[PDB]
Amino acid sequence: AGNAQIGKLAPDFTAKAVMPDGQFKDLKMSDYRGKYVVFFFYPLDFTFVCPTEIIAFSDAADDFKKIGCEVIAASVDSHFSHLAWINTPRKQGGLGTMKIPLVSDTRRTISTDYGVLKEDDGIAYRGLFIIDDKGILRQITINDLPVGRSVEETLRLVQAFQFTDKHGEV
Amino acid sequence: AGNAQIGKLAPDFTAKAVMPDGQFKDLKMSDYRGKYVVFFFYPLDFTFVCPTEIIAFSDAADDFKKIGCEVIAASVDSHFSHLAWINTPRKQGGLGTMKIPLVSDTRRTISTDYGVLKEDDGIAYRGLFIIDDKGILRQITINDLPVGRSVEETLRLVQAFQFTDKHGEVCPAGWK
Numbered sequence: 314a315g316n317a318q319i320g321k322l323a324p325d326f327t328a329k330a331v332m333p334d335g336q337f338k339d340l341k342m343s344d345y346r347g348k349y350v351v352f353f354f355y356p357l358d359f360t361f362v363c364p365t366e367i368i369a370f371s372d373a374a375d376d377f378k379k380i381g382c383e384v385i386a387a388s389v390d391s392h393f394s395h396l397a398w399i400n401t402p403r404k405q406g407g408l409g410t411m412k413i414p415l416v417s418d419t420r421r422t423i424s425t426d427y428g429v430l431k432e433d434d435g436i437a438y439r440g441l442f443i444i445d446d447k448g449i450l451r452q453i454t455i456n457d458l459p460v461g462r463s464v465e466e467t468l469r470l471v472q473a474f475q476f477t478d479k480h481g482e483v
Numbered sequence: 484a485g486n487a488q489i490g491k492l493a494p495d496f497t498a499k500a501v502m503p504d505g506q507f508k509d510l511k512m513s514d515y516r517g518k519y520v521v522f523f524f525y526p527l528d529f530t531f532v533c534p535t536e537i538i539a540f541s542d543a544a545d546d547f548k549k550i551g552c553e554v555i556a557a558s559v560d561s562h563f564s565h566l567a568w569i570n571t572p573r574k575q576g577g578l579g580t581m582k583i584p585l586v587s588d589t590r591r592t593i594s595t596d597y598g599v600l601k602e603d604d605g606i607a608y609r610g611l612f613i614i615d616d617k618g619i620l621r622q623i624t625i626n627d628l629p630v631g632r633s634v635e636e637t638l639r640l641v642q643a644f645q646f647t648d649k650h651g652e653v654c655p656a657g658w659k
């Protein structure tokens with residue numbers, strides 16, 4: 314399934330997000346046109362999987378901001394689940410404040426469009442997508458639920474696509 | 484496109500390959516069951532682009548072998564084209580001797596099944612795939628042509644999957 318293809322416009326969408334300041338907002342993918350985007354899905358809120366991945370990405374938000382790349386996280390949980398999890402401090406098992414928006418895909422349409430829905434669980438796989446400043450998909454990464462992604466590898470990829478966009482290697 | 488899905492058997496195939504020793508052989512994907520496989524595609528033999536990425540995976544072949552993992556490369560070029568490229572010295576643009584088999588996908592079915600075929604060019608994207616020792620597909624990576632992959636990242640992933648197969652997910656006590 315999915316319309317997500319390398320070299321073609323990433324699937325657009327409008328969805329509820331908890332913004333870093335804790336406020337609900339309607340977020341459109343096409344609103345980030347003019348900057349690279351790291352769009353990564355996680356399965357569920359709370360502790361279905363370890364929250365070290367989502368945290369590592371929030372803490373590197375500034376490494377991505379420095380090279381003009383926005384980072385956005387998404388799951389099928391409600392925007393109300395996201396906020397309850399953010400408003401639970403880290404010292405009591407919660408996420409605490411985040412430096413990236415969390416997107417809600419309760420209709421499962423975004424997961425479906427990006428080819429990352431695990432159909433039997435109704436849950437996204439650990440998908441990560443790199444989208445360029447014109448809205449084109451440059452990179453697809455999907456992992457089975459037990460293994461997390463690498464901030465440092467994602468950073469290598471974004472700088473390498475940015476670099477080759479303005480040069481052309483040898 | 485494709486039948487490659489996380490949690491399903493990696494799509495099987497039989498194809499001509501140039502083995503490390505220089506001999507042609509009919510290589511079948513399901514023959515690698517009992518071990519992990521890193522299966523990666525590159526676009527084309529003999530480009531002007533340096534084959535750094537392909538050489539780097541060749542030289543890490545041993546590192547993968549030690550942890551119970553085989554590394555296989557593929558493009559839509561013929562095995563005759565692969566052989567010509569290995570027998571071209573690195574100094575004059577060639578590949579030199581290789582420590583991993585180069586699979587030939589002249590029918591483009593493998594590329595199609597793994598969903599990495601760039602239609603307008605008729606070549607593969609830089610897709611890379613991690614298949615477990617039961618032939619189940621664990622990880623999908625697809626880069627646009629300008630950006631290569633990382634041996635080190637591929638090692639982290641292979642080891643990470645092997646570890647979770649035995650122990651389950653790494654999580655700190657409490658719920659991180």
Ligand SMILES: [Ca+2]
Pocket residue numbers: 389421434435436
């Ligand atoms: Ca669901």
Ligand SMILES: [Ca+2]
Pocket residue numbers: 362363365366459460461652653
């Ligand atoms: Ca984890």
Ligand SMILES: [Ca+2]
Pocket residue numbers: 505506507
């Ligand atoms: Ca021969």
Ligand SMILES: [Ca+2]
Pocket residue numbers: 517518519550551552616645
């Ligand atoms: Ca093994």
Ligand SMILES: [Ca+2]
Pocket residue numbers: 498587588589590591592593
């Ligand atoms: Ca073939």
